[PDB]
């Protein structure tokens, strides 16, 4: 509901220097936080009109204020601009603004407690002087402190501005400084020579140009952002990211402020700090694209950037990454192999165990991982072995040299760890041997039960072999009498004379010289 003459008016927004104090961004203020004094003025009204009106409105003499229209430039900045108050004073408000509606103007005034003390709006020769803005960067707090503005002749040399900078910043005089120009977002160029004049020092010298300076100090290197150049590259690339714990359901998460240019290490460090913990103790997850939730694990050595990780979020969603806190160190967690096998205890019973040696490890390592975990029996050896079983037969015993990479548990029950009995520890090598024993009953492919290694002795006779089997095999004499005992090789078997046959060691050795092929074995014929 505009009404008749609304089109002859324009909004003029006046901003006072106190609005610049506290700003951490580029230029002088954040457009979304700035507080304006607003005027509704005739477009065709004059400059002297607005100036006088403003003087009386604001409680300052007209002689004592200066107007610097705010100018939005193609280089990505909005800066205060020069206005000759007299020369242009009879041009119109809409003219002077180049049809910007609203029009923002920086209004310079005097303190005025300093104005009670006599001070005045300074000399400004629009041809030979320049107004500069001064910002001090403190690397310890990583912040910008607004140091106000100066007037200086153009021909004055940078070195001559150092004491004013030191003063406005609370620095003891003759403190060495690094000066930068803030040209635009993501461009802050160090001023290399202090002994040249302002036209040479600054890129393209204008009123409203910004100088950012800092103490030149070795403690600056302790900061995450040691120079203003770095500080501004950081702020230019800042992005807020919600992190959620994957393990904890439904968790809303916490917001962390990061930079798109950060690598794995940097991100880890920041998130690890907000959780009070080692970054090496975290694992992170990529994104699933359009679905919310955790994607694939992010390797500790990831080469990309946070921008690469965040690239799949659409224009407006919350950017969200999932992590998991780790009981252990991530380079170890990644290389950790989960080896599932059977522990066989002193009671001749099977427990399922999962051990985690290093995947580059060997059998000796897996064994001691298991020995750390279990109670051994009674008197016994305190020495362990690893058997490989397929179809309830032992296909072989494994030596500790063997790399773990040489095994593939095609089945969860393929591998068995067991404590070596005392009679078998160091066997008398000439007159006795170990044989694998398995249960079968119709055929020798008919295998079942728990298989085992048995010691047999040369010239020894079978009945006390049957007794040795007895003591271990848990059960009593009746259908242990069902048992008929065989010697098996490959295809076929034959059943030992249950008496009398006296053990001849190698009715059980393979063809002499042949190791690789599976040995003869002792079969047990019974059902279940």
């Amino acid at each position: 509901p505009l009404g008749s003459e609304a089109h002859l008016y324009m909004q003029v927004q006046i901003v006072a220097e106190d609005q610049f104090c506290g700003h951490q961004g580029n230029d002088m203020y954040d457009e979304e936080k700035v507080k304006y004094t607003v005027f509704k003025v005739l477009k065709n009204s004059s400059l002297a009109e607005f100036v006088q009106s403003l003087s009386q409105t604001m409680g300052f003499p007209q002689d004592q204020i200066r107007l610097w229209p705010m100018q939005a430039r193609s280089n990505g900045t909005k800066r205060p601009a020069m206005l000759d108050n007299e020369a242009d004073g009879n041009k119109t408000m809409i003219e002077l603004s180049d049809n910007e509606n609203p029009w923002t103007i920086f209004l310079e005034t005097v303190d005025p407690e300093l104005a009670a003390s006599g001070a005045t709006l300074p000399k400004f020769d629009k041809d030979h002087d320049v107004m500069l803005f001064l910002k001090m960067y403190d690397p310890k707090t990583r912040s910008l402190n607004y140091c106000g503005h100066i007037y200086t002749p153009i021909s004055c040399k940078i070195r001559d501005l150092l004491p004013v900078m030191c003063d406005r910043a609370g620095f003891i005089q003759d403190t060495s400084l690094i000066l930068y120009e803030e040209v635009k977002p993501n461009l802050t160029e160090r001023i290399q020579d202090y002994d040249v004049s302002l036209d040479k020092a600054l890129d393209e010298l204008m009123d409203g140009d910004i100088i950012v300076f800092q103490k030149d100090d070795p403690e600056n290197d302790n900061s995450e952002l040691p120079t203003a150049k770095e500080y501004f590259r950081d702020l230019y690339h800042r992005v807020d990211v919600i992190f959620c714990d994957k393990t904890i359901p439904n968790d809303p998460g916490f917001v962390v402020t990061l930079s798109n240019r950060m690598n794995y290490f940097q991100v880890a460090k920041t998130v690890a700090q907000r959780l009070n913990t080692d970054p090496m103790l975290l694992q992170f997850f990529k994104s699933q694209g359009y679905r919310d939730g955790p994607g694939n694990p992010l390797r500790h050595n990831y080469e990309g950037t946070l921008r690469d990780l965040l690239q799949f979020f659409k224009p407006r969603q919350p950017k969200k990454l999932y992590y998991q806190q780790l009981k252990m160190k991530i380079t170890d967690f990644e290389n950790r192999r989960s080896f599932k096998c059977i522990w066989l205890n002193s009671q001749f019973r099977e427990e399922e165990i999962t051990l985690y040696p290093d995947k580059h490890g060997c059998v000796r390592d897996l064994l001691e991982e298991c020995k750390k975990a279990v109670e051994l029996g009674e008197k016994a050896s305190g020495k362990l072995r690893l058997l490989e079983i397929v179809s309830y037969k032992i296909i072989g015993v494994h030596q500790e040299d063997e790399l773990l990479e040489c095994l593939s548990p095609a089945t969860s029950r393929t591998f068995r760890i067991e404590e070596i009995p005392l009679d078998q520890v160091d066997i008398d090598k000439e007159n006795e041997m170990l044989v694998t024993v398995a249960h079968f009953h119709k055929e020798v492919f008919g295998t079942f039960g728990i298989p085992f290694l048995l010691r047999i002795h040369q010239g020894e006779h079978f009945r006390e072999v049957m007794k040795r089997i007895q003591s271990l095999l848990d059960i009593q004499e009746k259908e242990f009498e069902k048992f008929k005992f065989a010697i098996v090789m490959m295809g076929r078997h034959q059943y030992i004379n249950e008496d009398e046959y006296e053990v001849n060691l190698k009715d059980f050795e393979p063809q002499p010289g042949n190791m690789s092929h599976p040995r003869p074995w002792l079969g047990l014929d019974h059902f279940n």
């Binding site: 153009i154 036209d199 393209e204 010298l205 204008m206």
Partner: peptide, 13 residues
């Protein structure tokens, strides 16, 4: 003597 620039010519977008 030395003078200011009139307009900003570098680093446009």
């Amino acid at each position: 003597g030395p003078r200011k620039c009139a307009r900003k010519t570098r680093h446009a977008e």
